[PDB]
Amino acid sequence: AEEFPVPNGFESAYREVDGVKLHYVKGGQGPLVMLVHGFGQTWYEWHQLMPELAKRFTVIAPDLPGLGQSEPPKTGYSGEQVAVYLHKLARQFSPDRPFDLVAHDIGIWNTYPMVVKNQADIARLVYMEAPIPDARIYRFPAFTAQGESLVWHFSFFAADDRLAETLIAGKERFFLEHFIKSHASNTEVFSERLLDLYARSYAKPHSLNASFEYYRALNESVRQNAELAKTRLQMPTMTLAGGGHGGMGTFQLEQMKAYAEDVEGHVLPGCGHWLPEECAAPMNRLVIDFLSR
Amino acid sequence: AEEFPVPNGFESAYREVDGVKLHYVKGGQGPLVMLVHGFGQTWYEWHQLMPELAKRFTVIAPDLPGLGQSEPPKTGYSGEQVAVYLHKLARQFSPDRPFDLVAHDIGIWNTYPMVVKNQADIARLVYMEAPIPDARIYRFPAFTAQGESLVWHFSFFAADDRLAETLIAGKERFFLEHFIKSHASNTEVFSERLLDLYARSYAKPHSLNASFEYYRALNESVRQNAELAKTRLQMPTMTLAGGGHGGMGTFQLEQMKAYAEDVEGHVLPGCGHWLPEECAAPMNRLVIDFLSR
Ligand SMILES: CCCC[C@H](O)CO
Structure with a gap:
């Protein structure tokens, strides 16, 4: 049973990594590109980009541990722990060459440590629409003059007593919309169909919990990254962010400038947080061209 | 019926003010002091302080419009709108003499405009544990290096689509604890017994909604107060804040200095947001002494 439809020419498969059964969707030929989704979503957010990339690359899109059809991590949900699973998964398919990495939202949190610790393994890097966990996140406001802020959910999701699971259970589709x-x-x-699909996936009890455990580990991830960031990133990097409502705007590139020597950025007007779906055509073009250099 | 037990020698009653039936508990004799509660609670938070004050004052503790046993406001939930109800209620019992005011949490939001617009009616003022609505509220963080922030709930409660009522209905007792x-x-x-009492009250559907409408009106209150604050408060004022987990700390006094000519502030160590219950002895003493000057 597949939670989301697989594109023609791709296969839905699983690999055990450190005792954790990871789900992924894979297709194409050539050097490897790994696409890593974020909160509220699964591998499927990449389903429009995938067949285009597959003309030039081997493409793999895993479900994050605990989400989609992947088993929860057996170590923990901090960025360093989760990155081990993703790094080892990619290396199963690209043991002898560096691979490319594209990540969205918490996909960034869950890949940054393996990028910085294994720079020789990463040919090119694309990050979109999320802060790398560092002290900058503590400056985002709780409330705005126009209503709810962008990241008040950081506190909602990190709260104890299973606050988020308890309030959201039974109302998963409503909240996600x-x-x-x-x-x-x-x-x-x-x-309605797309929202139905994403809601059903993250409403699985272990997935609803997994979703918030990423946020419960966020402060630990920040502390981890404070040490890791002493080593700058050397590989060619591109950032993307939305310039419309819901987007990160200039923050994405400005933060990345503190991390990477060689970085170019774009802000996409008329697009919010969910770039692969809200602005598929120009986002896909920018990623394809950057990786094809 | 009575949601909370009245202290001996006090009466539970109602007064219609501009078409809205307000519930209050009243006792004692002498000059009037009005005690105004905040979010998650009702007049009952004052029930330990009330007997002591009643030895020297006529004491009234109303339920805020829509909360406890008070009807929702008929105008709206902004600070200036709600303050009219509270000012008129107080002046029914003290028409020819100024009265004292003690307010906690959103009790501050709902009284500040009537204090500034009717300064001669207010003899002495005690404010505790919340910001006066102004530009400072936009500087509070969404997330902290320790976990959930003090006021991330401002965004949760203000969110469109009745997000908060939809998630919290039926889980009121869990959420409030x-x-x-x-x-x-x-x-x-x-x-558990005390939490049962508070939760039963705010679980009334009109009360759960009313709670959040105060936050949906917060930006309006900020705009209102930008004009009102051009006139400083002249009456003797005291601020209290908790110095422990969940408390406002030094913010309370520092903000009040911008608003008041005559202010003294205290931070109570080992006490959080809920001063009358967490730290009844020192809080009650501070309030009684200040008012008895
Ligand atoms: C909305 C910007 C992205 C920040 C986080 O990844 C939120 O889940």
Whole structure:
């Protein structure tokens, strides 16, 4: 049983990594590109980009531990722990060459440590729409003159007593629609069918919990990254962010400038947080061209 | 019926003010002091302080519009709108003499405009444990290096689509225990029995909604107060804040200095947001002494 439909020419498969059964969707030929999703979503956010990339690359899109059809991590949900699973998965398919990495939202949190610790393994890097966990996150405001802020959910999701699971259970589809649309410019791309699919996936009890455990580990991830960031990133890097409602704007590139020597950035007007779906055509073009250099 | 037990020698009654039936508890004799509660609670938070004050004052403790046993406001939930109800209620009992005011949490939001617009009616003022709505509220962080921030709930409660009521309805007792304890230093005073009492009151559907409408009106109150604050407060004022987990600390006094000519402030160590219950002895003493000047 597949939670989401597989594109023609791709296969849905699993690999055991350190005792954890990881789900992924894979297709194409050539050097490896790994695409890593974020919160509220699964591998499927990449389903429009995948067949285009597959003309030039071997493409793998895993479900993050605990999410989609992947088993929860057996170590923990901090960025360093999760990055081990993703790094070892990629290396199963690209043992002798460096691979490319594209990540969105918490996919960034879950890959940054393996990028900085294994720089020779990473040919090119694309990061979109999330802060790397560092002290900058403590400056985002709780409330705005226009209403709810961008990241008040950091506290909601990190709270103890299973606050988020307890309040959201039974209302998973309702909450996810609110959350997605509050962070979107182009809400029309999120059809009832698409929202149904994403909601059913993250509503699995272990997935609903896994979702928030990433946030419960965020402060630990920040502390981890304070040490890791002493080593700058050397590989060619591109950042993308949305310039419309829900987007990170200039923050993405400005933060990345502190981490990478060789970085170019784009802000996409008329697009919010969910770039692969809200602004598929220009986002896909920018990623494809950057990786094809 | 009575949601909370009246202290001996006090009466529970109602007064219609501009078409809205307000509930209050009243006792004692002498000059009038009005005690105004905050979010998650009702007049009952004052029930330990009330007998002591009643030896020297006529004491009234109303339920805020829509909360406890008071009807929702008919105008709106902004600070200026709600303050009219409270000012008129007080002046019914003290038409020819100024009265004293003690306010906690959103009790501050709902009284500040009537204090500034009717300064001669207010003899002495005590404010505790919340910001006066102004530009400073936009500087509070969404997330902290320790975990959930003090006021991330501002965004949760203000969110469109009735997000908060939809998630919290039917889980009111769970939510309130988490909210209260997470804002406390001395959590032990919040017995299951006491939490049962508070939760039953705010679980009334009109009360759960009313609670959040105060936050949906917060930006309006900020705009209102930008004009009002052009006139400084002239009457003797005292601020209190908790110095422990969940408390406002030095912020309370520092903000009040911008608003008042004559102000003294105290931070109570080992006490969080819920001063009358967490630290009844020192808080009650500070209030009684200040008013008895
Ligand atoms: C909305 C910007 C991205 C920040 C985090 O990844 C939120 O889940």
